[PDB]
């Protein structure tokens, strides 16, 4: 397993250095995970989940943003047949500012 | 427009001609009936159309439309459970058949992440899409696909 | 009960209890410092900075695109402060129509 | 108001016209399109 | 009780950590979108 890790780490860390705009994505996905964990830690420490709709609104806005970022990264690494690298952004923006409105309506 | 995907446009008009006059659909949409099914089958088709258009192409904008029309069907009828348990079955059958691609990931994850949080906004549905057994299938497949994508990366850099 | 009947009162249910303020304040400070850390990582550490910037008419389209992206989130934030849904819809339809054109013009011009 | 037999005839004529134009379209497309 | 008469999401003290997360994700997303079209 050591050989696989050795041959994958340098490959990924060279790919992320050849393309700069693949470092914007992942270091924005990573921290999202942290946010999720933090919220979970909170519900663990305060063992009562009184506003459960608020917890869901604060956790979905992380999960459903991580998945959209991952889809954008996949569609930028090697684009899909019909759609170009410029629809990949103007569709991610629309889906993101629809999810944001849904998650702002959920929490109130 | 949904049969225009499965085959050429010439084979879709026939389907329309069938569904315009057929007693199995006329029975519940007669001139006087004002039930939920009156509006609940149209959306049933439209969502499926977009899902095909989203799964066949892989775009995100064709899965957000499917999520929006699935929220509209959730608001309009209590038979959304059928879609919620049929789309994951399609994705799963494509997973184990060995036809996983980078299009299923984007399409399904966008559809789920938007449709579930949108369908939670109906006061009658409430928190069921995370509590009831019916919707659990969808959630399961969500987790499953998150694994498979990572597995694909391993295939990219590991001998078969 | 010809003469008189005993008094009756309704025993309510206890309301669900909130949590102490200091814990929430600590957990808000943690999220704030995390966001600031992400911003600092973007700016300086990861060397991901503003290499090329649009100028002239492409810069005006850029300003329009930013104006649209920020205006939608201002609309959503104002809707989160008890604004009517219909008003939000009208304010979004009066901003998408110019904003869609400007954003498409920018994304086709710049690439 | 329109009677009931007149409406029955109208519905049957609409269905026949639809089912004939569909076949005309399909038989034009089968030949004229590159196969 | 109608939806408009429940206590707001900021009057509660248990849910001040679930609004900071949303505001932070929104701010980070805005800055990300801005920096994406301004980088080689
Ligand atoms: C991983 C899978 C399986 C495991 C699971 O995740 C998925 O994790 C379980 C998690 O534990 C969940 C339970 C946790 C506790 C939850 C408690 C919750 O109560 C909610 O009930 C609403 C009813 O209206 C409240 O709304 C108002 O309720 C008023 C009181 O009646 C308040 O006043 C007011 O303020 C609130 O607003 C809402 O405020 C409140 O929170 C309940 O409605 C759902 C609940 C029971 C959950 C059901 C679904 C789960 C079991 C989840 C599910 C199995
Ligand atoms: C593209 C659209 C156009 C509009 C439309 O659909 C397709 O096509 C119209 C079509 O032409 C139809 C009419 C055709 C002419 C018919 C005439 C008929 O008139 C009768 O009424 C008697 C009353 O005394 C008269 O005597 C005598 O003349 C006849 O016995 C009427 O009873 C039904 C009728 C009017 C039809 C009613 C329904 C329509 C109008 C159809 C419908 C609106
Ligand atoms: C669907 O429709 C159906 C039918 O329409 C609905 O069913 C009805 O629901 C009603 C409410 O749930 C219910 O009413 C209650 O029935 C209880 C039955 O008790 C039986 O046993 C006792 C002995 O133990 C018998 O005396 C009694 O006759 C029955 O045979 C009653 O016990 C309830 O009485 C209490 O409430 C009434 C109304 O307020 C009071 O007048 C009465 O004195 C009791 O009050 C005590 O409890 C209340 C609880 O809120 C307190 O507020 C109050 O201050 C009293 O408190 C004292 O006692 C408690 C308990 O010991 C103690 O803790 C406290 O300190 C005090 O000492 C009441 O009568 C109907 O019977 C029922 N009908 C049928 C046919 O089933 C159904 O709800 C509908 N569904 C929905 C979802 O709405
Ligand atoms: C932290 C952050 C921020 C980010 C991190 C990253 C990230 C993205 C995280 C995301 C979250 C994660 C990671 C989650 C993890 C979870 C996991 C990994 C799980 C394991 C996987 C499994 C196990 C898969 C396998 C499926 C599986 C369980 C299968 C078992 C369950 C099952 C099979 C249940 C039952 C199936 C069933 C019942 C099927 C058929 C049912 C149907 C079709 C019903 C339809 C009925 C109809 C038609 C109803 C219509 C009703 C109307 C007609 C009438 C209505 O009435 P009216 O009111 O009049 O309208
Ligand atoms: C912790 C979160 C950090 C994630 C950031 C890095 C993720 C990553 O490496 O994704 C790469 C990988 C490969 O993408 P391609 O463009 O097709 O590769 C080109 C050649 N095959 O893509 C994915 O892994 C997407 C799915 C990631 C799911 C992560 C969940 C893991 C659950 C255990
Ligand atoms: C940007 C586009 C995003 C569109 C995606 C739709 C998914 C979001 C669904 C939630 C929106 C529901 C809605 O609009 O009703 C709002 C409504 C009014 O809120 P206000 O009091 O005015 O302001 C509150 C301020 N805190 O709030 C509610 O309580 C709604 C409760 C459940 C809504 C039921 C949905 C109604 C039917 C929806 C489909 C019908 C559309 C048919 C039109 C053709
Ligand atoms: C547009 C074409 C104009 C056709 C004009 C002919 C109309 C006609 O003659 O119908 C008469 C007739 C009776 O009129 P009276 O009530 O007797 O009024 C007498 C006062 N003079 O009118 C009706 O009641 C017809 C009822 C509606 C027809 C039902 C069938 C409709 C089919 C739907 C077609 C829509 C598909 C197009 C998309
Ligand atoms: Mg019914």
Number of domains in chain C: 1
Q: Is residue C12 part of a domain?
A: no
Yes or no, beta carbons of C76 and A45 under 8 Å apart: no
Q: Classify the C-alpha dihedral A60-C36-A39-C26 as positive or negative.
A: negative
Ligand 6 contacts (CB < 6 A) are A 98, 101-102, 105, 108; B 68, 71-72, 75, 118, 121-123; C 82, 84-85; E 3-4
Q: Is residue C98 part of a domain?
A: yes
Domain spans of chain A, in order of start? 1-108
Dihedral Cα B133, B138, B143, B145, nearest 10 deg: 150
What is the rounded CA–CA span in Å between residue A106 and residue B96?
35
Q: Show Cβ contacts of residue B7 under 8 Å, excluding neighbours closer than 6 positions.
A: none
Do B160 and A6 form a contact (C-beta atoms < 8 A)?
Answer: no
Q: What is the 3-state secondary structure (H, E, C) of chain A?
A: CHHHHHHHHHHHHHHHHHCHHHHHHHHHHHHHHHHHHHHHHHHHHCCCCCCHHHHHHHHHHHHHHHHHHHHHHHHHHCCCCCCCCCHHHHHHHHHHHHHHHHHHHHHC
Distance (Å) from CA A94 to ligand 2 centroid: 49
Q: Is residue C4 part of a domain?
A: no
What is the rounded CA–CA span in Å between residue D32 and residue D24?
12
Tokens, residue A41: 């830690």
Q: Is residue C3 part of a domain?
A: no
What is the rounded CA–CA span in Å between residue C10 and residue C75?
45
Of C72, C73, C111, the CB nearest to A86: C111
Of A67, A83, A94, the CB nearest to B109: A67
Do A102 and B68 form a contact (C-beta atoms < 8 A)?
Answer: no
Q: Is residue C101 part of a domain?
A: yes
B102-119 vs A87-107: helix crossing angle, rounded to 10: 20
Helix, strand, or coil (residue D7): helix
Of D15, D22, D30, the CB nearest to B13: D22
Q: Is residue C5 part of a domain?
A: no
Quick check: do B and C touch, 3+ CB pairs under 8 A?
Answer: no
Residue for token digits 């005006």? C60
Q: Is residue C105 part of a domain?
A: yes
What is the rounded CA–CA span in Å between residue A92 and residue A98?
10
Distance (Å) from CA D1 to ligand 3 centroid: 60
Closest residue of chain E to C106, computed from CA coordinates: E37
What is the rounded CA–CA span in Å between residue A40 and residue A11?
33
C83 lies in which domain range? 20-111
B102-119 vs B37-57: helix crossing angle, rounded to 10: 150
Angle value at C-alpha B123, between B117 and B128, nearest 5 degrees: 60
What does residue C11 show for φ and ψ, rounded to 5 degrees?
A: -90, 110
Please provide the size of chain D in residues: 35
DSSP string, B34-96: -STHHHHHHHHHHHHHHHHHHHHH--SHHHHHHHHHHHHHHHH-TTHHHHHHHHHHHHHHHHH
Tokens, residue E26: 């929104």
Tally Cβ neighbours within 10 Å of residue C28: 18
The experimental technique used to determine this model is cryo-EM
Residue for token digits 């949590």? C19
Closest Cα to residue B153, out of A90, A7, A91? A7
Q: Is residue C14 part of a domain?
A: no
Q: Show Cβ contacts of residue A106 under 8 Å, excluding neighbours closer than 6 positions.
A: A53, A56, A57, A60, B117, B120, B121
Q: Which long-range contacts (CB under 8 A, 24 or more apart) does D27-31 make?
A: D29/B8, D29/B10, D30/B10
């Amino acid at each position: 397993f050591q050989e696989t890790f050795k041959t994958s780490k340098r490959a990924y860390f060279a790919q992320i250095e050849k393309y700069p705009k693949l470092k914007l994505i992942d270091t924005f996905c990573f921290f999202l995970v942290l946010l999720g964990v933090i919220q979970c830690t909170f519900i663990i420490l305060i063992r009562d989940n009184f506003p459960f709709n608020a917890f869901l609104a604060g956790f979905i806005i992380c999960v459903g943003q991580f998945v959209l970022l991952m889809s954008l990264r996949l569609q930028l690494c090697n684009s899909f047949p019909g759609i170009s690298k410029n629809r990949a952004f103007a569709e991610f923006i629309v889906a993101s500012l629809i999810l944001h409105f849904v998650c702002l309506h959920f929490i109130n | 427009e949904f049969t225009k995907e499965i085959k050429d446009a010439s084979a879709g008009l026939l389907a329309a001609g069938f569904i315009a006059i057929v007693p199995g659909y006329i029975s519940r949409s007669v001139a006087g009936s004002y039930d939920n099914e009156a509006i609940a089958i149209t959306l049933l088709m439209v969502t499926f159309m977009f899902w095909i258009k989203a799964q066949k192409t892989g775009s995100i904008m064709h899965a957000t439309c499917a999520a929006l029309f699935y929220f509209y069907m959730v608001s309009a009828w209590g038979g959304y459970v059928f879609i919620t348990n049929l789309i994951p079955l399609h994705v799963f059958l494509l997973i184990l058949m060995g036809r996983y691609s980078s299009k299923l990931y984007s399409a399904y994850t966008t559809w789920y992440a938007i449709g579930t949080v949108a369908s939670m906004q109906i006061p009658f549905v409430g928190f069921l899409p995370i509590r009831s057994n019916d919707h659990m299938a969808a959630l399961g497949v969500f987790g499953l696909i998150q694994i498979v994508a990572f597995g694909d990366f391993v295939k990219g850099q590991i001998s078969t | 009960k010809f003469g008189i009947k005993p008094e009756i009162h309704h025993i309510f249910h206890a309301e669900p209890k909130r949590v102490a303020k200091p814990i929430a304040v600590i957990f808000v400070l943690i999220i704030f410092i995390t966001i600031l850390s992400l911003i600092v990582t973007w700016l300086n550490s990861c060397a991901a900075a503003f290499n090329n910037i649009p100028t002239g008419v492409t810069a005006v389209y850029f300003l329009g695109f930013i104006a649209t992206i920020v205006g939608f989130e201002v609309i959503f934030a104002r809707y989160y402060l008890g604004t009517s849904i219909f008003e939000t819809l009208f304010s979004s339809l009066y901003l998408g129509a110019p904003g869609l054109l400007t954003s498409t013009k920018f994304l086709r011009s710049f690439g | 108001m329109i009677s009931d037999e007149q409406l029955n005839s109208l519905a049957i004529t609409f269905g026949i016209v639809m089912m004939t134009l569909i076949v005309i379209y399909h038989a034009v497309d089968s030949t004229m399109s590159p196969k | 009780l109608a939806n408009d008469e429940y206590p707001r999401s900021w009057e509660i003290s248990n849910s001040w950590v679930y609004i900071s997360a949303i505001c932070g994700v929104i701010v980070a997303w805005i800055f990300f979108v801005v920096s994406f079209v301004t980088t080689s």
